[PDB]
Design a protein around this ligand. Structure first.
Ligand code: NAG
Ligand code: NAG
Ligand code: NAG
Ligand code: NAG
Ligand code: NAG
Lengths: 346, 346, 346, 346, 346
């Protein structure tokens, strides 16, 4: 079968950052192509062909005039016509970082997690093996419990246990994957900084519906220049665009806040991770020699393991048999169950 | 199952070189067919049928006139009508080289990599076999370490190790696949040279929206010639085409730069490859007898293997157990683990 | 699984001969149906229904008139209307020969190659068997090498090797499949000879965009004949058709040249084939008794096997272990490897 | 898996007889619906609604008038409107016989060929068994060869060989399947006789493109009858229909000729079939007791087996090992190979 | 896999009774929607909106008028508008009985045929077993043959032979399934009786294309009633509907004739059925105790068995090894083959 590399945070982010804006984009496209581009109040003299020319020129030129001349460069309205493509551009731009992280991390994370799942499976098999002599030691004794636990900790270190210790020690000082994850999310934030600014500058000031274009050719001059006509036009699609702009602004701002909160929780406020607590459940040191640097590789690997917690069978059951992450502090029940489950079968 | 032959770099290149321009092409087609081809300001007399004839003729002829006669050959505008097809032609042309390389390298690379993966699997199985006597030699000894490593290197040459040496020696002087890869990427660059030039010539000079056509027939002469009418027309689709042209120019220029940078890094600045370092991890000579020519077949086979790194199981684990590519310079732990993992099982 | 019979060159030919023209045909259809069939400058008096009748009649009749009567038969323009169907006809005609060859060779080539792949597999298994006693012979000896090779050639002839020799001898004088392949490619060339001629005769002379039709009925005579009106019409789709005609002409001419070059290389300039050299690698006579007639069945079976080179596992490896097609001229390493690989396993 | 019953000649016939006419029919439909039904030169007085009524009535009535009254029954043109449905009817009618033969022969031919393939497999297994003692007999002898072959023919008759003889004798006088095949192909020819005649009558009689209809009601009489107006109409789709009619005529005539030639070759000129020659290859009588009647069931079963030649494995190889259909006339090599292949394995 | 129950004759019937009329109905829909509903010769005064109102009213009312008043109920034409739905209704009604039979017989036929196929398989295995001692008896003897056959017939009764006898005896008097099949076919005929009559009534008398409707409202009265205008209208779709009606009539009448002939052949003229002759082949009584009532269950089960002939392997071969349905009357070959094929294998 296949192993998962997603994580609910990342998929929620990509959904709310790309899928929703794509839906709004297609909705705007449908609304705009269902209606007519522009509505121009052509004079009475205009024939139907001339009126069509006016309604086409005023939608291609799309530049508002002023009562008097008042300028040679008068305000334009091109953004009302260009937005429903800029939204697609923003959707693609904000979808790029997920693809980049996928390309840059697929093989590496696949290999690392493939090794880690087997390593944890063997670690919990070793835990099953090592809990067996504890009951015999306790009966031999029959603080007692404290000294028994201390001597067990001293004398239990297995070869694969040293393998785990060395692996954790080397990973703790190899922040490559944490670097990549932080880079991906910071890149998402920085890219989102662009459309937020653009839309806020578009929702804020450039919200105009009606203008008055000026047609230039004006035939019928009869060897003369001819009268330059001014035609008042109104755009029908500005309202939905101006509403979708605000919707997208709010959505992307909320996504930015969510990303920042998650990063702060993971790299500053977080103290205990998944794998560390899971190992401590069976009983290990978890000393600071591989800690005190929250910007650590295992720190994020914990999240992937938690998502893939059920990709490995054994661990699963061992987690739900007990609680409190003190599996080795009971005298009889929790360890006696494993004793009768495994020791006799051999 | 299937084995991959696509490098992330090549897939990124083909995406950004073909898929994006195809998307822009279909967007331009949608915009052009949603709108109306041309908008002509027909005179007042023109009936609807005559106006339709004018709006069709001026879009078929598509040749701008001048105030006076001033010529018999006056500037044309055929490109504004022809571009959204030349863009498809460029997309297909730039997709050609990938298909050519596929057709010319499928079987050869398939066979070569099928042989290489099995060879490396057997090589690492041999490494597992050969690490076992090293611990026994060390205990027999109990600079010591340096002389032990030297004698091990001298006396460890295995039959399949000689197979590997001969294979590498013969591949180092057979640059066929490197020739083909350089040819493919240089061909992509050369093909990109064409549309870049064309679009830059189109975005640069031939960018105008409004012209004035001259209708020729002019019936209603009543046994006479008739009046040759001049009709001012405006194209609605020039703006989007002129923007997509710039977008494509920038995209393809960036792709060209990426191609050149990758080639320079791979064939000039690169010093160490994947397979060489991987073999040196277990310990081999890696002498210059099969090196000093970066334009080498194994140089790219390294990249193909790296993409297919996880297609071979054993190697994977052996990479993450240790680091520093000095697996055999550790006295106990690294080789003691393998000794207990393999020697006792026999 | 399935076995291939595509031989890249044929697939390239059929692509460039059928698939591309089909794409151009559908592009022309899209352009023609997106536009209007004809644009006619109807007089002022014409109502909308009469103008529609004129624009329909002048596109159904589609025969250009002349200033005066000047004839009862005046030049026509039916090809501008008929081409985008003749192009489909040419595509189908050029696709026919591939289907014919498939129908006529499927079963026979399937059977022949199914026999040949197993036959070569057994041959290389025999080669593995026969290299084993050679090393013992050399050690017994310990020109020596030349006499050893000669005696080995004399005394090594195996039963299945006589099967090989008889099969090759009988195939060398049975040119049925070579006949069929030459017939297929010559038929493709001959069928291409038609569309090239037609399109060149169309791109060359029958190229004009505007004509003047003459409407016949002319009601409103009020018990009289009525005025025969002349209406100037312009076709919008001639330009794209005239460009696609040239594109197809160039493409099919290049395909013809490629076919001719490939045939000349294969049947005249070619001297060594795949199977012959592959057998000589292990060492056989390859005498002219089954050669000197390049128009030979085994000649194209060699290409078919080369395409299917990896459909037989063993051979593959045996090709990449050595080079120079002198596998049995090395004293030790090449045959010592096989000796340790096979002799001990028995 | 599945067994084939397609006999490529039949598939070619059905292709060129049904699929091509269906393609032409859909092409005609596309052309007719893309265009306008009829083009009528309505007078000036007509409004747009009256002009639409005229253009609809003259295409529903579709009956040409004459200058004077000249009749009450004047020539009609209904076939120009009805053909693109008669073509569909002809396509379905000519597809019927294939479906009829399928329904009437599926089970019977399935069972017969399922029995025959196993019978021939067993027959060639017996051939392998029986060639073994021939070498021993020859060595015992060591005309000699002729007497050995004669005595082998006399004494070799095996049980399943008598089974084969009885089966062939009973099939030779049971012409049911040959009857059915001849009936199918003669029925295809007879059904083709209809559309050939109809189209040749249509491609030769109906060539009118233009007529002059007479509208009947003519309101505005103001308590009077009103003027019966005559409107000249032109059909746009007659040209393509008239061309497709000729194309279909030629195609179906060529198919008829191909069918007749194939039947004449199979049932009159044919002398040797597949199964008879294949059995004679190993050596049997093939006497006229089951021959002299070319209209025989086994005659077409031979073609069916030839199409299914590779559906049985053993036979395949046994065909390519030798040639000349004289397998048992070779002294050593051909039979010695089989001896070493089979006799020792037991 | 799946077992077949379609009885291809019933597939032919359902095809020709439902699938063809559905094709004709969709063709009529395509014709009617490609054209316009009605063509009305509106007077000159009518504007375009009033003309549209007239062309819609006269097609909604669809009731022909008369020159004088002549009635308050004048002939209608609703059928010309209602037929292309009545055809769909008839198609569904005709498809109903097949669905009913399937729903009512699926499980029962599944169980019955599942039993019977294995039952016949066991019967033919028993026949293979029982032919073996016959050769021994014949050699013991060495009318002789007649006495041997009669003593075999008396002494060969096996337990499963009595199972066969009892099953046949009990089925012969259980005519439920024959009842169901006859009911299905007679119901198909009776349901066909409706559309045949309706269409023959529609094709016969209700055939007129042109009528003259009378518009009622007639505004512009200026405080007065207004002039009741009469508008001549013509339907364009009557011709194709009238042709399709005749086509359907002929098709369904021919289907009725086929059904009647098949039923008469099956239940009156039929004498020997598949299973009876198949069992008589190996030799059984087939006495009239389970016969003389052609309206019998096994009578129809024979057809399903014949369709499912090849669904049981053994039977197949045993049918074609011999002929004449006298397998046991041959002395040596037919029985010696089975003897040497089975007796030695035990
Ligand atoms: C209108 O038509 C007359 C002749 O028909 C021509 O002289 C005049 O220039 C036309 N006016 C315009 C504005 O084209
Ligand atoms: C105008 O109409 C009259 C008759 O109605 C015709 O003789 C004349 O040719 C028409 N003029 C043109 C320019 O077609
Ligand atoms: C013109 O209209 C009148 C009635 O308005 C009609 O009688 C006459 O036939 C029409 N012209 C022709 C050529 O039919
Ligand atoms: C045309 O209109 C006038 C009044 O508007 C009316 O009297 C006359 O009957 C109308 N024509 C017909 C054919 O009814
Ligand atoms: C025509 O217009 C007048 C006023 O302009 C109005 O009173 C009258 O009702 C109109 N005609 C009809 C038929 O309504």
């Amino acid at each position: 079968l296949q192993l998962k590399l997603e994580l609910p945070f990342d998929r929620v982010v990509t959904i709310g950052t790309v899928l929703v804006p794509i839906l709004l984009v297609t909705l705007v496209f449908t609304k705009n192509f269902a209606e007519e581009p522009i509505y121009c109040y052509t004079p009475h003299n205009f024939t139907r062909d001339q009126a069509l020319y006016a309604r086409g020129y005023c939608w291609t030129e799309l530049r508002d005039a002023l009562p008097g001349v008042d300028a040679s460069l008068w305000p334009s309205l091109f953004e009302h016509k260009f937005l429903p493509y800029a939204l697609l551009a923003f959707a693609a731009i904000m979808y790029v970082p997920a693809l980049g992280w996928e390309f840059l991390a697929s093989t590496r994370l696949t290999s690392e997690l493939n090794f880690l799942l087997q390593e944890i499976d063997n670690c919990y098999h070793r835990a099953a093996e090592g809990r067996a002599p504890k009951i015999e030691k306790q009966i031999q004794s029959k603080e007692r419990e404290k000294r028994e636990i201390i001597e067990n900790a001293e004398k239990e270190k297995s070869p694969e246990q040293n393998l785990f210790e060395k692996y954790l020690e080397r990973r703790g000082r190899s922040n490559f994957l944490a670097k990549l994850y932080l880079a991906r999310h910071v890149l998402i934030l920085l890219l989102s900084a662009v459309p937020i600014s653009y839309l806020c500058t578009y929702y804020a000031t450039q919200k105009q519906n009606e203008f008055t274009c000026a047609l230039g050719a004006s035939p019928d001059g009869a060897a003369g220049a001819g009268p330059a006509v001014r035609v008042s036009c109104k755009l029908p699609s500005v309202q939905l665009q101006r509403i979708i702009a605000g919707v997208d602004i709010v959505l992307l701002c909320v996504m930015n806040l969510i990303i920042l909160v998650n990063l702060i929780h993971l790299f500053i406020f977080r103290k205990s991770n998944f794998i560390f607590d899971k190992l401590h459940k069976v009983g290990i040191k978890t000393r600071r020699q591989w800690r005190r640097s929250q910007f650590c590789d295992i720190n994020i690997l914990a999240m992937f393991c938690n998502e893939n917690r059920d990709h490995i069978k054994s661990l699963n059951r061992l987690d739900f048999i007990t609680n409190e992450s003190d599996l080795m502090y009971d005298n009889v029940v929790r360890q006696l169950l494993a004793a009768l489950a495994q020791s006799n079968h051999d």
